[PDB]
Write an enzyme that holds these catalytic residues in place. Structure first.
Site, PDB file in Angstrom:
ATOM      1  N   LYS A  36       3.193   6.818   5.047  1.00 23.05           N
ATOM      2  CA  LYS A  36       2.316   5.866   4.387  1.00 23.05           C
ATOM      3  C   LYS A  36       2.886   4.463   4.614  1.00 23.05           C
ATOM      4  CE  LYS A  36      -1.189   4.327   2.323  1.00 23.05           C
ATOM      5  NZ  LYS A  36      -1.309   3.512   3.592  1.00 23.05           N
TER       6      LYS A  36
ATOM      7  N   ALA B  87       1.054  -3.433   4.155  1.00 21.78           N
ATOM      8  CA  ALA B  87       1.254  -4.796   4.650  1.00 21.78           C
ATOM      9  C   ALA B  87       0.878  -5.671   3.472  1.00 21.78           C
ATOM     10  CB  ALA B  87       0.362  -5.159   5.881  1.00 21.78           C
TER      11      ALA B  87
ATOM     12  N   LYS C 294       0.149   3.875  -2.805  1.00 15.93           N
ATOM     13  CA  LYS C 294      -1.000   4.814  -2.791  1.00 15.93           C
ATOM     14  C   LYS C 294      -0.621   6.267  -2.862  1.00 15.93           C
ATOM     15  CE  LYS C 294      -4.043   1.251  -1.319  1.00 15.93           C
ATOM     16  NZ  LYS C 294      -4.294   0.266  -0.194  1.00 15.93           N
TER      17      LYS C 294
ATOM     18  N   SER D 212      -5.629   3.574   3.909  1.00 11.63           N
ATOM     19  CA  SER D 212      -5.240   2.444   3.088  1.00 11.63           C
ATOM     20  C   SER D 212      -6.369   1.757   2.333  1.00 11.63           C
ATOM     21  CB  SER D 212      -4.570   1.372   3.928  1.00 11.63           C
ATOM     22  OG  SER D 212      -3.214   1.644   3.999  1.00 11.63           O
TER      23      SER D 212
ATOM     24  N   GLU E 288      -5.319  -3.861  -6.569  1.00  8.37           N
ATOM     25  CA  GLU E 288      -5.528  -4.337  -5.197  1.00  8.37           C
ATOM     26  C   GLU E 288      -6.662  -5.386  -5.211  1.00  8.37           C
ATOM     27  OE1 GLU E 288      -3.167  -1.899  -2.229  1.00  8.37           O
ATOM     28  OE2 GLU E 288      -3.869  -3.928  -2.527  1.00  8.37           O
TER      29      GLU E 288
ATOM     30  N   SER F 181       0.776  -1.233   0.000  1.00 11.73           N
ATOM     31  CA  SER F 181       0.000   0.000   0.000  1.00 11.73           C
ATOM     32  C   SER F 181       0.809   1.284   0.000  1.00 11.73           C
ATOM     33  CB  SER F 181      -0.945  -0.010   1.171  1.00 11.73           C
ATOM     34  OG  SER F 181      -2.034  -0.887   0.918  1.00 11.73           O
TER      35      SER F 181
HETATM   36  B1  BJI Z   1      -1.801  -2.252   0.832  1.00 12.29           B
HETATM   37  O1  BJI Z   1      -0.651  -2.754   1.766  1.00 12.29           O
HETATM   38  O2  BJI Z   1      -1.545  -2.744  -0.588  1.00 12.29           O
HETATM   39  C1  BJI Z   1      -3.292  -3.097   1.390  1.00 12.29           C
HETATM   40  C2  BJI Z   1      -4.355  -2.687   2.391  1.00 12.29           C
HETATM   41  C3  BJI Z   1      -3.485  -2.568   3.659  1.00 12.29           C
HETATM   42  C4  BJI Z   1      -3.828  -3.735   4.550  1.00 12.29           C
HETATM   43  C5  BJI Z   1      -3.282  -3.804   5.978  1.00 12.29           C
HETATM   44  C6  BJI Z   1      -2.318  -2.748   6.477  1.00 12.29           C
HETATM   45  C7  BJI Z   1      -2.059  -1.583   5.579  1.00 12.29           C
HETATM   46  C8  BJI Z   1      -1.245  -0.398   6.044  1.00 12.29           C
HETATM   47  O3  BJI Z   1      -1.485   0.701   5.526  1.00 12.29           O
HETATM   48  O4  BJI Z   1      -0.502  -0.567   7.009  1.00 12.29           O
HETATM   49  C9  BJI Z   1      -2.597  -1.476   4.196  1.00 12.29           C
HETATM   50  N1  BJI Z   1      -2.963  -4.496   1.709  1.00 12.29           N
HETATM   51  C10 BJI Z   1      -3.742  -5.582   1.524  1.00 12.29           C
HETATM   52  C11 BJI Z   1      -3.123  -6.927   1.966  1.00 12.29           C
HETATM   53  O5  BJI Z   1      -4.899  -5.537   1.080  1.00 12.29           O
END
Ligand code: BJI
Length: 263
Positions: A209, A212, A48, A105, A141, A45
């Protein structure tokens, strides 16, 4: 400071995984400290921010409006869509989508914006044009979080992402007004509390930003500095760990504690 590198190596030992780290001077762009700076890691993420950067460039160019409203439906909804899922009925403006993708996110918000700019291939072309020939977005995503070992798709290098973020936040690429809007979104981040933010002293500035993904992937990009203004860029990625999310959050925050202590 080399004592921070000791912590970075210690985190690799604790996590049983690769950690990539870079500390970059905002003003001059000089690399202050690095660990695996040119190895590829999945962006997750953290992309983004790049996405909204491309959206802002279109806004500057007259091709897009922050106030434009986008309608979508239940079929567009993906896992991790806390904000978009609550606005099915009225839709949301470009501005709110970027705010949701950055501060929360929200996955669906990013997909919608990706669509408006022409998809991964165009985000990738926008980066290429700004001198980043390494970072590449290939999927949407949430598939981009797969983190298949050795796969180049949806990856960046700590040095590439740091230098790209510096150009976005300080280059002539975006107008002053858009740069600020971008920084405003990152500073309002609401899901990165247990990461760098937990090591930050009172009065410091932070715009960040996180992300995960699968295979123990976790990462964070940030511009931060004392007395309410940023003066360094820090990028930290890790992948491959079998550790829990809490353990991954902890090591990242211990890396931040070290960076701050040795500012
Ligand atoms: B991003 O990492 O592509 C997305 C949504 C996300 C899930 C959990 C934690 C975060 C963050 O901002 O710490 C972001 N990831 C997934 C697996 O959908």
């Amino acid at each position: 400071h080399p004592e921070t590198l000791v912590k970075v190596k210690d985190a690799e030992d604790q996590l049983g995984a690769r950690v990539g780290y870079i500390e970059l001077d905002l003003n001059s762009g000089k690399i202050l400290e690095s660990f695996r700076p040119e190895e590829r890691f999945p962006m997750m993420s953290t992309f983004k921010v790049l996405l909204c950067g491309a959206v802002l460039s279109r806004v500057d160019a007259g091709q897009e409006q922050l106030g434009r409203r986008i309608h979508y439906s239940q079929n567009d909804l993906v896992e991790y869509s806390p904000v978009t899922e609550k606005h099915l009925t009225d839709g949301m403006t470009v501005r709110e989508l970027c705010s949701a993708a950055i501060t929360m996110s929200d996955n669906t918000a990013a997909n919608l914006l990706l669509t408006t700019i022409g998809g991964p291939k165009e985000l990738t072309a926008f980066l290429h044009n700004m001198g980043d020939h390494v970072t590449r977005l290939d999927r949407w995503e949430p598939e981009l979080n797969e983190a298949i070992p050795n796969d180049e798709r949806d990856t960046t290098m700590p040095a590439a992402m740091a230098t790209t973020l510096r150009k976005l936040l300080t280059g002539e690429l975006l107008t002053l007004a858009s740069r600020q809007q971008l920084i405003d979104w990152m500073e309002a981040d609401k899901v990165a509390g247990p990461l760098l933010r937990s090591a930050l002293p009172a009065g410091w500035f932070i715009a960040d930003k996180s992300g995960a993904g699968e295979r123990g992937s976790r990462g964070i990009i940030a511009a931060l500095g004392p007395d309410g203004k940023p003066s360094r860029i820090v990028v930290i990625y890790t992948t491959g760990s079998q550790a829990t999310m809490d353990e991954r959050n902890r090591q990242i925050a211990e890396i931040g504690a070290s960076l701050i202590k040795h500012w």
